[PDB]
Structure formats: structure tokens, C-alpha cells
Amino acid sequence: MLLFCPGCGNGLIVEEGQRCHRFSCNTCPYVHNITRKVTNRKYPKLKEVDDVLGGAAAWENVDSTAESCPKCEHPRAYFMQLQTRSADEPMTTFYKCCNAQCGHRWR
């Protein structure tokens, strides 16, 4: 991330000093000792999973005492939650039922 000097407002660079790594200006004496953990997360966009889950994928989210699907009232359905974009998104819930003489897609 860009961080700028309170004095002159040039762009800081990271360098190493005699006790710590420092943010330092190139044109004025201002330096800032990195005393503790500092971070910057990108969170990029992941791949689309819409066609990845269709067609009997290797799902695993099913559990004992899981709810039956609301239409068929049988537990013959898988359900999963995934982030569709980056992992700061709250996970969405979705489910699909596949039974004899019964094909449907639900949300």
C-alpha cells in the first residue's frame, strides 16, 4: 500500500535499519520503525463454481440428522455453502435434489 510522509508527502519505501526494518522517506529525515505486524490483503476473485458442482461432483457437506429437502421431504439431496467471490463474502446456501422421476434445482 502507498503510505506517505507527514512532513513532505513523498512516497515511503521500506528499508532496514540497525534495530528494525523502517519505512523511510527518500527526501526528508522522517522514518517509521516497524514495531509490530502490519499487513495488506488483496482478496482476489476466485473461479466460478456453477458448472463445477453440476453433474455428481465430489461433495461432502452432508451430515447425520441433516434436513430433508422441502419439496420431496426426503434427505435425497446434497447441500453446500461456498463463497462465490473473495472470502470476505458471507457464504451463500444452496441445494439440489436428485431423485427417481424427479429433477429440480433450488436455492
Partner 1 sequence: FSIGIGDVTPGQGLLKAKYELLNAGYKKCDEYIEALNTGKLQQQPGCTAEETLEALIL
97 annotated as belonging to a binding site for a ligand:
no
20 annotated as belonging to a binding site for a ligand:
no
**Binding of partner 1 at residue 47 (CB under 8 A)?**
no
**Binding of partner 1 at residue 56 (CB under 8 A)?**
no
Which residues are CB-neighbours of 92 under 8 A, at least 6 positions away?
A: 81, 82, 83, 84
What dihedral do alpha carbons 40, 45, 46, 47 form, nearest 10°? -160
Q: What is the residue type of 5?
A: C
* Separation CA 98–CA 45 (nearest Å): 30
Helix, strand, coil percentages for the chain (3-state, nearest 5): 5, 30, 65
Stretch of residues binding Zn ion (CB under 5 A), selected from 34-42, 43-51, 58-66, 75-83: 75-83
> Which listed residue (50, 60, 73, 88) binds partner 1 by CB under 8 A?
50
> Which listed residue (30, 49, 53, 84) binds Zn ion by CB under 5 A?
30
Number of residues that bind partner 1 (CB under 8 A): 5
| Annotated binding-site members | 5, 8, 25, 28, 69, 72, 98, 102
